[PDB]
Ligand binder design. Sequence first.
Ligand SMILES: *Cc1c(COP(=O)(O)O)cnc(C)c1O
Ligand SMILES: *Cc1c(COP(=O)(O)O)cnc(C)c1O
Lengths: 387, 387
Amino acid sequence: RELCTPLRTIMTPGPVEVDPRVLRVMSTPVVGQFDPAFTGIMNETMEMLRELFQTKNRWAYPIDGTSRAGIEAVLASVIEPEDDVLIPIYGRFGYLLTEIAERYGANVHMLECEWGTVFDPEDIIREIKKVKPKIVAMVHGETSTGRIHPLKAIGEACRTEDALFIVDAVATIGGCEVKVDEWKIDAAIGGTQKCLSVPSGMAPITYNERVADVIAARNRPITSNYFDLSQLEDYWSERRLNHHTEATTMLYALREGVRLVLEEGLETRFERHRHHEAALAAGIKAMGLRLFGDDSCKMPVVTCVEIPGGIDGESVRDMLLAQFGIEIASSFGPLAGKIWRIGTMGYSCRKENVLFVLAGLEAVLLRHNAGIEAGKALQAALDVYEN
Amino acid sequence: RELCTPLRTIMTPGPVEVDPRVLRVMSTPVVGQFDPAFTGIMNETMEMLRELFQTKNRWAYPIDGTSRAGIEAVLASVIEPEDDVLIPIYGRFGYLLTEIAERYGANVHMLECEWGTVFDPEDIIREIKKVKPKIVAMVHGETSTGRIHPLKAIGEACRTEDALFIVDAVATIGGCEVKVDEWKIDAAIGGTQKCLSVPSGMAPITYNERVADVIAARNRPITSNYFDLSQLEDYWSERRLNHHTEATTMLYALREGVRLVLEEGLETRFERHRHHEAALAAGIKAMGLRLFGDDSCKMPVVTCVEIPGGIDGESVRDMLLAQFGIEIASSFGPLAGKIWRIGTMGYSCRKENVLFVLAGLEAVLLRHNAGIEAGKALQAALDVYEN
Ligand SMILES: *Cc1c(COP(=O)(O)O)cnc(C)c1O
Ligand SMILES: *Cc1c(COP(=O)(O)O)cnc(C)c1O
């Protein structure tokens, strides 16, 4: 009755596999929040998060919940009843931002486009100019539709218009370029279990003086005590204000998981994600499958494969897991039954996984009488791995 | 540049040392939230939490957050602006409950007594009858003061007056008796890094149909999306609502930590916490030191030792740490400089740690001069272990 779990090959958009070097560190005996060993770990983790987010911000630190708690914590700390919040939505995660904003009493201005595509930044900028929102909140990369949004012009427009540009980089941080200072992002929130390959359940964040200034003004309480950044900043600085018992093991794992990213090198790691995305694409293509969505804003780290006429996609996903231990994602909501989503993130983004997922998917589709030519998919991925 | 950390002897009231069986399991490769392997771990964890809390409640499951995010999610889900909430406060964590409740728009009625004592339940029950609150929120064991509060008479009055009795059992669960059905507790929240000896960063909760019907009536939604128990209940049952990525590794750890408590036996485990408490106590006494606080309501898992006049309590704590790797807690706020708090919780509650903490504290107190005698401390703890 000790735990017994299968070894999966995980090719969803998250949570993804964790590097063995992060796994092994989690068996390390704990130290307390106020132990000098712990404060040294905290401090180094903040420095690594500044390089990771490509920022000089004084404020780069983790919060103890999932990705969404991190997003909630930022938005809660900068929204007051009736502030205008502009939110451009092109996928499922844009609606989470609106749910959060509205819950904290914001007047929410939304824009929407066709799932599968992205906005012209110009349409967002014009709306910024028109409404003069306090906050523009946006998803960098929507795993629901597989698109990644250009953010630089939008950031520069928030800064000229004196808006705070708040970004959910949960699915992109550690996998796709995210440049907080260059794109004039005012606060960014990441997550651990996607491209960083750290166990789910912590949310690294960063924000600049413009965001901190607004937080310091809070005059009326931030509604969530646990998500109060004015007390979280006292935690993550010399005061060591006893706000909550930071998560010991999870901090050890984040520390290691970010060290590994920086060892790889950011640009090298980005280019490495694109390389495996290319091998996957060529296999899927040779297999006779089509990709969903606008190919010019394709998120590098998620691939959206169209489910063919007359095949049950749930049945394919379930056989893949039950027979091969291979996990990919369906869609629930507007794209339900239209696509599978194959993630290539973090430790899961490697040659052995890309090859196993194509072999797996080919075998399961031939079993469901998909019209494929057997053997083409793997040859096309191996061609990219050799070349 | 890999993590390197000292091995501490942790004798604070949290976070404490983790059983090695829980540690080794955190190196297991992750599976996803929607993988049957993970739903199987979910379901067994919920059964075990029913036993841990001594309840039949359908609702017993962790939320991803420190203990006080657990507390916040329960209070958020049950409080609408202007609800009356009675909070009897006898230590520091009583004020966190009032903070959270006020922030959610409650009209808070507080009672406050002297730190180091508890209420006569008849005074509380009289305020219940008078205020007729929707909710009574209370701490079971205040580690800040070392007092544990009787709960049964209070829960019985809450049930007859049709108030919800919501209990912070964070410091007591798995260490001291908690009987949620018997004491007519409507909602209880635990934490992991205390008597459970699970890495901090999750909060096991339980609640009954009285609590669940108020959550279902939510008309005005709960302000926190992440702490929305109404969505968290669809997460932790048949429909598998995608509310958040459960924290994979922290769930492994909770599962194993609760399994170990249940293998020990709740009553055996509570008696084992008493045994070590008694040995620590005879050691502290024979050392010529005094305990703070009302002996009739002493929390079994914390022991508050009076700092003798002319001894810098911080200097003593720092030296124990720096030389012996032994960690004890100071107090901040009203008890600052009056007491050290020595925790005997979970895996830290063991004869080796009890012996080492007395040996270390004896040598340090002698170094600070130190009107104590000898090997009296150890012989007296050894006498109790021998009997
Ligand atoms: C220590 C403690 C807490 C703290 O919980 P965190 O995991 O630090 O959020 C809350 N309530 C009580 C009684 C405590 O002793
Ligand atoms: C997965 C995801 C989130 C939130 O993730 P959780 O860790 O499950 O709370 C937010 N934004 C994007 C784009 C995501 O993919």
